Symmetry: D3
Subunit: 232 residues, 6 copies
């Protein structure tokens, strides 16, 4: 069994949908056609989802880059071929990207540590195009407006007042949103030959919805099934 | 209510015992005299422990520095005065520090990112002496052998083969153990005027027990009650 | 007139094809339907290309990141909306990617300086998806096999023996090819809201063709015309 | 003979008191019960002190981290087991820590270079607890009020106006005092398995006494004798 | 033949005058006594100059550090013994150093990347004294007033508004002028045992002539002939 | 009075000769024509030397960059115009530069901290040419063979075995010698508009004489008198 996910390599599907909150797994699994509870250890909850004729895991990775890296490494080193993260984010363009808006991200700022412990900082955190394109196409098909851009992946949710946050810098650099895991997923995926992507819903802004969440989940599930079809 | 711990500032005790696994909270709370379940959100589980006439929270912080920082910031900014982490670690001195051995750590290597987003890297991750001294004294009283030293707090649990891990370097520098949160707790505590400490049990070695865990938990609970007495 | 390109903002087309060698501009312009020589100053040669009913500039940017940044900034700050770089590269996967092979790159390693003088190193050098997708589709249409991957953009062509080159590190990290400008183009484009892309032909390997070049040029010209159609 | 201290390894006592000024050695040695002048080379003056039945060296280390490292390395590599630095410092909390106040420090900011040439910057500069506890206890016994905290060890005494000093940053981070050697002593001690500590008297503030110095010296001498007793 | 300069090692003279613009080579070669056109590839134009009885190449290196490094490495690894750069620069002391003024520089700020890929950043970018002295003496002989100082060699000509430029910092540090190649030439020369120097004419200021250019060219040619005499 | 040198600004001569050891001041002052003892505080000993009709201070600066910076800042901010360091060094080219050989250095590697706390690391540590030329000319006049090159100024005299020393790297980069202060003197001098230089005698090699010292001192004194003549 995987040391922390507590599942076997035989239970790892080619496509895996990852989310941060173990509770969101339970909310996702009930909107699939059926499911099989697999394991629940620490913040890592794993369920096998059945959707549109296809099967793919949904696994929670917990909050933050170092914790999610444990999850992602165990999946990538044991059979996963596609990992899509669905999660929440904050808007770095509050005049254009509002609460409830959905963003499909192709790349990320590596404001973590574990990616730098894996490869030099000059290396890009970048998603797989085919995964990005699949998420965009599933949204168009469901007639759900979405934004596209770069996510700032930061290990600091609560800032202090001594070292200035770089969020305003990255906003001026046209980063779209902020969250805490995407860049780690992307680097690990690139290093391990796993195709990755990310779809995120805005729930706040670091500067001065149920319908949207349902839509984002449908997009994420729709894309997982489309990609899973290729590997079946 | 605190955004992620989902408890109120009135429920925050002066002393808090933190652990990584929500399950370990449940294992700890039943060996106290009594307890009050408070909240469970994401990987953050909070319980009020009653032990030796005193009361103190036990809260899980999840795996990894960025995730535990969310927990620690919410406690430090809302009334906590003492935070002791009890957890697991790997031995960096396998000829001297063996599986099951217990280490009480006074300082830590800042191989994370969030501490660096809070204060310059030259700043030390260091625990409070009185907390360190209390944990040592509780162990002596229970006649439980312990080691003392520096912990390497690393955001990388699974290494890759491109960038060498610094664990051997830090072993040669006489670091005792490795784990993934202590340095983050220490810096946040220093910045926020919260006294911190750490007690850890060895469960592996990155290089070439139930009785010990019970002992470590007794030491941690013993020290929490001693410190809580001062604030009551 | 632009200070170094020596053309006017009115002569800047929405789509620009950039190459390193002023001579390659002359080789490209004669395979278009017609052309208009615009300017030639330093290594910056500018020609207006007419191809498949569309018009777009072809401009040389010279060798190396600091020199090409002068070219790219003048285009991005004066009307350019799409910049595609067509150039040469070295294979970082010599068993899979051979001399003459063509690579369409979505992202790049920022081993330059000017990108870091513009934005923090954690920021990704990433291309525009629509541009990447257009280059891939034009190749499929012409039945020309291509590879896709990350380029290492390095300011050091001739290494010395004191500081080890990171090329082997990035090869192990699954970077596909090496060249000297793509990452600079990508960051400048992201900062300036300009869509960028890159198509490259392998002409060597840092470790132990005319038909292919013609094909790569046809792909690059084909994609420029397709994108130019949108802005006309 | 040691290359720069000009004493023999047989003259090295288990406990050594270090100070910056060779003159302070002469002021310290005359308040002991008796003494033996050993050597004086460059700024390194060594005397054997006899106090409360015990013997321990008092050695000057000069101004600044690179110069004191020569002194500390020669002691640690030739028999020293405990090194206590007694010196002066500036207040980083001028509303709380005033001129003449005494601070016993447990850790330090590594704003030097030599510590970084010895071990990675993430490593903590931290003192030995038993040494820290001994200095605190000797002060309580003599009824001498003291403060405890982190020292900023900076290689820059005279700032210029181009690069901002980090002293205000570290003050906001709750560093207590500033001086120029403690962090270097701590890292060298940790690497060499030597127990270190520091006691400092405030003589200024970087921002907007004889009785206290006598008290601080008594505390330092008192602690040296207590520690020396263990090794005799 | 050299890969990019397209000349043979037999055509490399001991002394080489380098300039950025291929056009400036043509302007320089006609004021010599005679010349021999050698090659023109990319931005690298090479001509053999005959002046005051001596012979030395004049070669263009293009804009920017990464591009000029290709030129400089090919010369230094194939016989060159002295390389003098003559070029343009911006004044960092606008009250003292005005448009048209000439500066002979002995050292440079390494705001590039390739020098750092060759040797650690602490290493100085410094010119050869004898070359510096020769340029100064040739100016005195021609009664041409000149300034002397440090050049900032920056890879960023067009700044953006997110990361502050260090030009004001270096101006306060008494750097005289800014340009984009000198530091790269100096480090490569030091590493390869080639004597280097730089003479520059002010053509702007980053903050709030034909006679001078002719004078600067005469100085540069005068110094090349003097140095070439030693090797003939 | 200057805070640490304990002399007045009126006692500061335009030319100052600095050495590390207070004892070397006493050895130097007796070979001048006459002298005036000024002050002795900590490792800072100041004497007014009379030589060949001129007067100039000789001041000891102690061991190491942070300590000598205190000395150099007090001189540069209070009237000094020329500072020459005479000292010892280790050979980084043991096959060419042997024990007793004398090296006159024009630039230095900034392996310190205080220079970096004053100005960004890309800035060169470089000496004044006129000072360098004067030292070379005084040696030629006395028929004393000398070498010229770059010094590595390192804060680490005693290396440990965890982090590799860069001395071999810098030797391969053609650095001539190693010592511990020159780079700090050069940066401080450049920032403060003080002309600096360095002359050094080899007394060891980090890898696998009285007549020479007398010669080096004569050269240093000879150059001080020549420079002092200009300011009198
Ligand atoms: O809300 C998610 C954060 N979700 C996680 C936080 C803890 C568990 C789930 C996005 N987000 C940020 C991510 C990183 C740093 C700062 C922010 C931020 C600021 C304002 C609004 C949203 C923000
Ligand atoms: O076992 C804990 C790790 N516990 C956490 C891991 C995930 C959840 C709980 C200590 N530990 C390490 C911490 C950091 C990096 C490497 C190691 C390591 C290697 C071997 C043995 C123990 C090790
Ligand atoms: O050939 C292009 C380089 N083209 C430019 C070089 C000068 C003008 C045109 C790709 N390339 C590299 C780019 C960067 C660093 C190293 C290499 C490299 C090594 C071997 C083979 C190809 C290589
Ligand atoms: O006074 C000691 C400094 N003692 C040494 C200085 C030279 C010899 C002895 C503490 N101190 C500082 C140490 C570091 C950097 C700045 C300061 C500082 C500023 C104001 C007041 C005190 C200060
Ligand atoms: O003009 C040369 C630049 N020449 C080159 C530029 C492109 C081809 C030739 C000096 N220069 C700068 C060099 C670096 C960065 C900024 C500046 C700058 C700013 C104002 C005035 C002059 C300046
Ligand atoms: O001897 C002087 C050092 N003098 C000072 C040392 C303490 C007081 C005086 C040159 N030197 C080095 C300077 C820096 C780092 C390493 C070395 C080194 C190694 C071997 C031989 C000479 C060496
Ligand atoms: Na977590
Ligand atoms: Na983390
Ligand atoms: Na160029
Ligand atoms: Na460049
Ligand atoms: Na000193
Ligand atoms: Na120092």
């Amino acid at each position: 069994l995987l040391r922390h996910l507590k599942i076997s390599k035989e239970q790892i599907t080619p496509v895996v949908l990852v989310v941060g909150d173990p509770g969101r797994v339970d909310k996702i699994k009930v909107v699939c056609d059926s499911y099989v509870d697999l394991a629940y250890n620490r913040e890592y909850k794993s369920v096998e989802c059945h959707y549109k004729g296809q099967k793919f895991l949904c696994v929670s990775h917990g909050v933050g880059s170092a914790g999610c890296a444990v999850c992602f490494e165990e999946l990538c080193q044991n059979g996963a071929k596609v990992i899509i993260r669905a999660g929440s984010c904050g808007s770095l363009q509050p005049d254009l990207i509002k609460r409830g808006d959905i963003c499909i991200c192709n790349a990320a700022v590596r404001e973590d540590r574990v990616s730098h412990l894996l490869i030099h900082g000059d290396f890009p955190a970048v998603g797989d195009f085919d995964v990005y394109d699949t998420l965009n196409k599933c949204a168009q098909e469901l007639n759900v407006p979405v934004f596209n851009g770069i996510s700032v992946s930061s290990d600091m949710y609560y800032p202090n007042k001594i070292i200035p946050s770089r969020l305003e810098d990255y906003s001026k650099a046209n980063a779209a949103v902020v969250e805490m895991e995407l860049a780690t997923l992307m680097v690990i995926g690139t290093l391990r030959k796993v195709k990755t992507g990310g779809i995120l819903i805005v729930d706040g802004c670091p500067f001065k919805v149920p319908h949207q969440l349902e839509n984002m989940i449908k997009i994420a599930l729709g894309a997982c099934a489309k990609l899973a079809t290729k590997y079946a």
